[PDB]
Structure formats: C-alpha cells, structure tokens
Amino acid sequence: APKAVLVGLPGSGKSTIGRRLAKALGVGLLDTDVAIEQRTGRSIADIFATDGEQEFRRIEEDVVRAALADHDGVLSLGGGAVTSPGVRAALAGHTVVYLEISAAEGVRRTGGNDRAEKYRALMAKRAPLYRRVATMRVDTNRRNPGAVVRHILSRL
Amino acid sequence: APKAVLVGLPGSGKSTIGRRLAKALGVGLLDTDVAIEQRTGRSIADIFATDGEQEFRRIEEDVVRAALADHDGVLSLGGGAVTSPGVRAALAGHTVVYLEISAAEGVRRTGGDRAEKYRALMAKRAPLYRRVATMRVDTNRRNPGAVVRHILSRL
Amino acid sequence: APKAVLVGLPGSGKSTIGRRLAKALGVGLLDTDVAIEQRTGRSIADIFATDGEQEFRRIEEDVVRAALADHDGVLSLGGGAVTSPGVRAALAGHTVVYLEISAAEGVRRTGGNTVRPLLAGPDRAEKYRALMAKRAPLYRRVATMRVDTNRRNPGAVVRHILSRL
Amino acid sequence: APKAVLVGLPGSGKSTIGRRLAKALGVGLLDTDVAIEQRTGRSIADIFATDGEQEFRRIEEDVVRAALADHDGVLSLGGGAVTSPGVRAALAGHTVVYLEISAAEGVRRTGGNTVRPLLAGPDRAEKYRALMAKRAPLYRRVATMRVDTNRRNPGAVVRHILSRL
Numbered sequence A: 001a002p003k004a005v006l007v008g009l010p011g012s013g014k015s016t017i018g019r020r021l022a023k024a025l026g027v028g029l030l031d032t033d034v035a036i037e038q039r040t041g042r043s044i045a046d047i048f049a050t051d052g053e054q055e056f057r058r059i060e061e062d063v064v065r066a067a068l069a070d071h072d073g074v075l076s077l078g079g080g081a082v083t084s085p086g087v088r089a090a091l092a093g094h095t096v097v098y099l100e101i102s103a104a105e106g107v108r109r110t111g112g113n114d115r116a117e118k119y120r121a122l123m124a125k126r127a128p129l130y131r132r133v134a135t136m137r138v139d140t141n142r143r144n145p146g147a148v149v150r151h152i153l154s155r156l
Numbered sequence B: 001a002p003k004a005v006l007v008g009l010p011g012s013g014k015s016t017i018g019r020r021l022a023k024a025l026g027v028g029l030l031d032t033d034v035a036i037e038q039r040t041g042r043s044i045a046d047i048f049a050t051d052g053e054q055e056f057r058r059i060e061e062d063v064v065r066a067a068l069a070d071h072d073g074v075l076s077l078g079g080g081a082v083t084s085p086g087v088r089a090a091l092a093g094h095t096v097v098y099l100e101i102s103a104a105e106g107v108r109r110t111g112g113d114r115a116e117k118y119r120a121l122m123a124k125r126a127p128l129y130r131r132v133a134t135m136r137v138d139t140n141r142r143n144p145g146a147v148v149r150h151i152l153s154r155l
Numbered sequence C, D: 001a002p003k004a005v006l007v008g009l010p011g012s013g014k015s016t017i018g019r020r021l022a023k024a025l026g027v028g029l030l031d032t033d034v035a036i037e038q039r040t041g042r043s044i045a046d047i048f049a050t051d052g053e054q055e056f057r058r059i060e061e062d063v064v065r066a067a068l069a070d071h072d073g074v075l076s077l078g079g080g081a082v083t084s085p086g087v088r089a090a091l092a093g094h095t096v097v098y099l100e101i102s103a104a105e106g107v108r109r110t111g112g113n114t115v116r117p118l119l120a121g122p123d124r125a126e127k128y129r130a131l132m133a134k135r136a137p138l139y140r141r142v143a144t145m146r147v148d149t150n151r152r153n154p155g156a157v158v159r160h161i162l163s164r165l
Ligand SMILES: Nc1ncnc2c1ncn2[C@@H]1O[C@H](COP(=O)(O)OP(=O)(O)O)[C@@H](O)[C@H]1O
Pocket: A008, A009, A010, A011, A012, A013, A014, A015, A016, A017, A079, A109, A110, A140, A143, A144, A145, A148, D153, D154
C-alpha cells in the first residue's frame, strides 16, 4: 500500500513532491503515467492517438489499481485518473494527498519552450474530484518543495 | 522539407526507423504527437479529456501542417493522423514512407482478444496509408538497419 | 531450474527475445531488471544515480541467485550481472544462451535511449563499445550457447533458440 | 542586447526564471538549450550522445553569439557555455544574473528528468560536484548581479531580480 498517493493538477507537484517524499520516507516513487506506458510498452500518446479516451482510461484504471494494490512506496496519479470510476472507488482507504495550486501558478510551473483558459476548465473538472478523494490537502502555491514535503509528513 | 515522413501501424517502426534514419542522415526525427504538446504546452490526454477527440484532430492537423513545412529532417506521424482528410491532403508531394507490417508481428513488437482489435485498426488505416505513401516497405521480414538503407538509397 | 538465461550486451534483445521466447514455450518470463525495479520500489536509473554500480550489483546478485533457484521459466539477465563473479558462479549448468551483437547494431538498437545508465548517452557509442570490451569475454565464458542476433529478426532468434533446447 | 542573461548551476533556475522573468518584463525568452534543439532539429541528450560535449560546445557558442547580438529579451544561458572562452568574452558588459543554488538542492531539482547529459547515469551527486567545481568559478568572474535561489521560490526570485534591474 503506498505510503502516500499524491494527486492534483498538472504542475501541482506530483513528481517533484513525489521524488522528494519518496526519498525522505525511504521508498521509491511510482508514477502511473510511467507505470502505464511501461507495462504496455506504448507511449500514452500511442494509446490515446490509437484507441481513445475510453480504452486509455480503462487501461489507466487497471494499472493504477495494480499499483495501489502492490506498490509500497509513493504513488503519483496520472492527472485525469480521478475521472475514471474504478479509480475513485480504489482510493477509498488509502492515504490521499491533494496538492492545491491556483490556476495562475499552475500555468506558470507548466511553461516549456489562452492556454490558461484551458487550464481553468481542467481545474473546474477535476479540482472537486481531487477534494472528493483527498484524505489531505496541502496548499502548494507559496511553499517550496521542502516545505510541502515537511507539511505532508508532519500530518503523516 | 522532411527528407522522409514515416507512417504505419503501431509496431511498424515509425519511431525506431524514425530515429535510425535521422541519425543515419545527420538530421533530427520530429514526432507529430511530440509536436502537439511541444506546441500547445498541454498533454495529448489533457485535450482529449478536456476538449474533444475530434477537436484534437483539428489541433494535430495544424501541427502536422506546420511540421511538414517547417521540419527538415525525418517526420514521424502519429498513426491516427490519417483519418484527417487535411493531413492526407497535406502529405501530398512529400516523401512518405509507409512502413508495412503484419498484424501478428505488429502485435508482437509491442512490449511486456487483442489481435482482432489491431486487425480492425489494420482494416481502418491500411487503406489510408497505402494511399498516401510514395514508398511502401516490408518491415515484416526485413531487419531494421536494412529497412533504413532501403529507404535511404531511394531518398 | 530455469529454462534458459539470455545474456549479452545491451540491445542484444534479452528482454525482447526473452518475452517472445517464453510466450513461445508457454512459460512466464522473469527480466531481472524489471525484478529489481519491482523489488526495491524504484527504477534502475535512480538506483544507479544515488547508490551507483556496486550497490546495484549487490542487489542484482541476490535477485538473480533467487531467480536461478525459483524461476522455472526464462530468465533474461541484466547486462552486467556476469560482471559479479558471484553470479557467474551460480550460472554453471543452467542453459546460458548468449545473444551475440556487433557494436554498431547494439548502439543503434538502444534507442528509447532505453533509460540505460551505463549507456546514458553522455557520449554513447564510446561507452557501449567499452561496455562491449568488458562484457563479451564474460558472456563467452558463462555461455553454453552463442547466437548471432545481427542479421536475424526476433522470430528467427526465438525459433533458432527453440531448436537448440 | 538581453535585459538579463541568467547563468547558474544545473538546477538553479536558468530556464525556469527565464520564462517567468520574460513574462514579468513583457519581453521574449531565448533558452539556448532550446534554441539548439530547434536549430539542429534534434535534442540535447541526443547531441551529446552522438557528437560529444566538445562539439555541442561549438554548436552552443554559435547560438550564444547570435543571441547576445539579436536578442533584447531574457536570455537563459546553456549551463556550460561559460566553459568556451569565446563565450566568456562575448559575455563582457552584459547584465549577467548569477543564479545561486546548493549542491544539495541543485541535485534535488535536477532530479526530475529530461536531458542533463553531463549529469547522466551513475553517481549524479558526483557528476554534479565535479561540474560545480568546474563551472561555478566561471560564473563568478562573468556575473554582474547574483541571486540566491535556495530557500526563495521562483516568483520571489523574479521579484528579487526585477527589483534590481
Ligand atoms: N512547490 C513547487 N515550488 C516551485 N516549483 C514547483 C513546485 N512544484 C513543482 N514545481 C515545478 O513545477 C513544474 C511542474 O512540476 P511537476 O510536479 O512535474 O507537475 P506534476 O504535478 O504534474 O508532477 C516543474 O518544474 C516543477 O519543478
């Protein structure tokens, strides 16, 4: 069972908070996007651009129950996995950390090289799923990673 | 433009010939799927799950259109991109290599009722690929390096 | 008693020919690199990054002396496990199949730049040939059976190994 | 010329700050790590792997000279451009803002992953303790301002730099 299951918007800090919290607890991180495109040997784009939302999410589900079931480390849920049904049932009992970041900063961490408008929708479609499965909310706007780690662990 | 543009089914080897034929030619492989989230800063999934499959096709198309005109090395086109009549229209004239592979082999080279599944997408696209290729190539028996020189001595 | 231990350089196909070879004898596969990632909790790149070869090798030995004792399937061995003399030693009298592979093919064949920390392409082909020099004497040494993968395709290599058992 | 040219250890914020800082000042970003990826059509990882460092440098210095000339935005300088004399000298006079970072935090923030081919494979910390020790003193002689990233976060650091330009 994962010691923590971190969820929240892209650029909430799933990997980054995860890599770090995994090192402090002494465990390994497992990313479900990594799990999926690993133990299918196709890229997530290969799956969407090839069999669609519906199959991918069913694939995502199945993979994330697996990792919920026998990853004993820290688990980062692929960002839209809390839409899938099977995935909200499965987090029931785990320790679930919701990383809150507001839409400006969420847009900023996500950079690379109107997009922010597509981010408010992602926010409005998921945020209240994130609260719905959350067993714990850490607001991350103003904290640095170490600080998000120590707030988390002190509640853990 | 692209010295080549690779199309095929999953397992054909767009990615693996893709890189190999780039390196082999002093240039870079671009990938249209890669180029979507390169250009829109948002992942392929967050597009589908946000704003429609069919909308994603209007995005892919526009990238493909720019990649075909902007990219001077090898292009690796995201399977799917060829349901879009614009993309079909936009390939016309470029070197397109259609890496052809069988169903069962196809299936084999994808990692550890699913042949039929791939049997359809075979059914679905095989015509579209065969119709836009300027160069077909049988990767079924051929080894990959060999594939690469095949194309290259036609480039 | 495992069925066949597939050894050789990176990109020789041990995990490829292994997955097929064991579908093909309806048996399970165990890939030690997948088992180490599975066991420890974290991936292979990281265990190198943080603890480096010796400690990885030490976890690798344990994971494989086990496989050689309780996997009855096909066991594809992580590239540098023959570098641990302990491993070389338990390998004796298993069927150690070695996928041989020139330099230029293996180089090219390792493209997802696979992950792969020893070949972490900081400057890649230099590194691979030098990992060929340390390792090819050691596979020749442990191997009961030696197989060109250059000019062959994964089917053929799965069948050729299928006759020789 | 560029409003600011950021330099720093891997991890210090060169690219990250570069985007936010250019939004803050309402001007362009030119990340040389990125301008190279575009110029050659291939990636950073992949250049180092195939052509070697001592050549990605020659590529790199080229894009850099271009930028100190053509660009008037925020410039995020490839982390090991300052190793090419030619660069250090074309950097004379430029407001070059040194991002400061712990080895211990530089290790942390580089540990997502993506590229970083000189940080590569086994023993990250020690590929890094070498790099710092062999790039930090160059940032020293070429920097005009310097700014501590450490416990401060990305937005206070754009405001730290903004309030001193
Ligand atoms: N708490 C934070 N403080 C500052 N930067 C952050 C913070 N968390 C993540 N970032 C940066 O945000 C970008 C997005 O981070 P990441 O955690 O990968 O998103 P995700 O939530 O999907 O894993 C990365 O550059 C990461 O370094």
